[PDB]
Curated annotation (Swiss-Prot), chain C:
Practical applications: Co-administration of salinamide and rifampicin or salinamide and myxopyronin suppresses the emergence of resistance to both antibiotics.
Organism: Escherichia coli (strain K12)
Record's signal peptide: none
Full protein segment contained here: 1045 to 1094 of 1342
Known partners and oligomeric status: The RNAP catalytic core consists of 2 alpha, 1 beta, 1 beta' and 1 omega subunit. When a sigma factor is associated with the core the holoenzyme is formed, which can initiate transcription. The rRNA transcription and antitermination complex (rrnTAC) consists of RNAP, NusA, NusB, NusE (rpsJ), NusG, SubB, ribosomal protein S4, DNA and precursor rRNA; S4 is more flexible than other subunits. In pull-down experiments interacts with CedA. (Microbial infection) Interacts (via flap domain) with Escherichia phage lambda antitermination protein Q; this interaction renders bacterial RNAP resistant to transcription pausing and allows it to read through termination signals.
Similarity remark: Belongs to the RNA polymerase beta chain family.
Protein name (Swiss-Prot/TrEMBL): DNA-directed RNA polymerase subunit beta
PTM: Acetylated on several lysine residues in the presence of glucose.
Species lineage: Bacteria, Pseudomonadati, Pseudomonadota, Gammaproteobacteria, Enterobacterales
Disulphide-bridged cysteine pairs: none
Task of the protein: DNA-dependent RNA polymerase (RNAP) catalyzes the transcription of DNA into RNA using the four ribonucleoside triphosphates as substrates.
C-alpha cells in the first residue's frame, strides 16, 4: 500500500501537532526546535503477531 | 579618625558624556572605590531596551518587505540600538506608522507621556515608493545585563503568534567608564585624593543617579561580611 | 516509485562560543577559550577594553 502525508499520526500528543496545519506540512515561519514534527507521514503496516 | 568623601560638581560635557568627582578621599582609597565602582557600573545598571518587534505583513526575519530597502534582518539590528527611557511603568508597547518616500527616523514613533525617546534623529529604515507603508509595534522592557533571544525562549509560555520577531536585548546604559585619581587639596591636609569618573551613558540614565545606585549595590552586599554569621 | 517529495528549509543562526576556531590571515589559528565579561578585559587609559 502507499504511504500518506496525512496530518493525523498514531498516538501523538497535541503539543507536537501544534505547528503543522491540517494538510500535514509545517507552516512558514514557525520556530521549531529539536525533535519537533515537520511533515506528518504514516506508513501502512500489518503482520503484527504481538 | 577617618575621612569620608562627599559628592561634588558634575561637569556635564555633552548628553552622553559626564564627569563626576568625589572630593575628600583618604589616602589609599582612590583605586579601591574606583575599580570597585567601574566594575559595578559596567556590569549591573538597570536599563530598558527593545524586546520583541512585530511587523504587519511579514512572517519571519529573513523575509523582505516590498517598498522598504532593507531586509527585515537589518530592521531588527537597527532597533536593538534604540535608546528609550520609561518613567512610570515597567514595560510599554510602542507603535510606528509611516507612509511615503523618505527615511523613517525613530522620531516618528507614536508620542506617549511616559515613554521618552532620547535619540530622535536615529535612522531605522528607508521608504522608496509612494504607495509604501510600514507599521510595526515595538516592545520595551526593563532589566539588566544581557539576555539573548535563545535563553529568553525558556520562559516563552506558548508564544502563540508566528509574527513575533524576537530581538536580543542588551539593557545597559553605560559603554565605557574611565577614572583617574589625582592630588585633591583640602585647606590643610598632607595627602588627599580626588576621584574623577569620566562616564559615558547612551543618553539614558542620569549620571548622579548611576553612582547612587552603584554604591547601594556595594553597601547592600557588604552586609554578609559585617555580620559574619558562620 | 516515488509519489511526492517535500523539501523544507531551516534558517538557524549560530552565535560564537567556546570551541569555535578563529584565525587571522597569517596562519595563526586558535580555538576560543572563554568569553569574559565586559569588565575583566584589560582597559587602557581611557576605559576602552580590548
Amino acid at each position: 500500500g502507499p504511504e500518506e502525508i496525512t496530518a493525523d499520526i498514531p498516538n501523538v500528543g497535541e503539543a507536537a501537532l501544534s505547528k503543522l496545519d491540517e494538510s500535514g506540512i509545517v507552516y512558514i515561519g514557525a520556530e521549531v526546535t529539536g525533535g519537533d514534527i515537520l511533515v506528518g507521514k504514516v506508513t501502512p503496516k500489518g503482520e503484527t503477531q504481538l | 579618625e577617618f575621612l569620608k568623601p562627599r559628592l561634588v560638581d558634575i561637569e556635564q560635557v555633552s548628553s552622553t558624556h559626564a564627569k563626576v568627582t568625589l572630593e575628600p578621599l583618604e589616602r589609599g582609597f582612590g583605586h579601591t572605590l574606583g575599580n570597585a565602582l567601574r566594575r559595578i557600573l559596567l556590569s549591573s545598571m538597570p536599563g530598558c531596551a527593545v524586546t520583541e518587534v512585530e511587523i504587519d505583513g511579514v512572517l519571519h526575519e529573513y523575509s523582505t518587505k516590498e517598498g522598504v530597502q532593507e531586509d527585515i534582518l537589518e530592521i531588527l539590528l537597527n532597533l536593538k540600538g534604540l535608546a528609550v527611557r520609561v518613567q512610570g511603568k515597567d514595560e510599554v508597547i510602542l507603535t510606528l506608522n509611516k507612509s511615503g518616500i523618505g527615511p523613517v527616523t525613530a522620531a516618528d514613533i507614536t508620542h506617549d507621556g511616559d515613554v521618552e525617546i532620547v535619540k530622535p534623529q536615529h535612522v531605522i529604515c528607508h521608504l522608496t515608493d509612494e504607495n509604501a507603508s510600514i507599521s510595526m509595534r515595538i516592545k520595551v522592557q526593563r532589566g539588566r545585563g544581557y539576555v539573548p533571544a535563545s535563553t529568553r525562549i525558556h520562559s516563552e509560555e506558548d508564544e502563540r503568534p508566528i509574527g513575533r520577531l524576537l530581538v536580543d536585548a542588551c539593557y545597559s546604559p553605560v559603554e565605557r567608564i574611565a577614572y583617574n585619581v589625582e592630588a585633591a587639596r583640602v585647606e590643610q591636609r598632607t595627602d588627599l585624593d580626588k576621584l574623577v569618573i569620566e562616564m559615558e551613558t547612551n543618553g539614558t540614565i542620569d549620571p548622579e543617579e548611576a553612582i547612587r545606585r552603584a554604591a547601594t549595590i556595594l553597601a547592600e552586599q557588604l552586609e554578609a561580611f559585617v555580620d559574619l554569621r558562620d | 516509485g516515488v509519489l511526492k517529495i517535500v523539501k523544507v528549509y531551516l534558517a538557524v543562526k549560530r552565535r560564537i562560543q567556546p570551541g569555535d576556531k578563529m584565525a587571522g590571515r597569517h596562519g595563526n589559528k586558535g580555538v576560543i577559550s572563554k568569553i569574559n565579561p565586559i569588565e575583566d578585559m584589560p582597559y587602557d587609559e581611557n576605559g576602552t577594553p580590548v
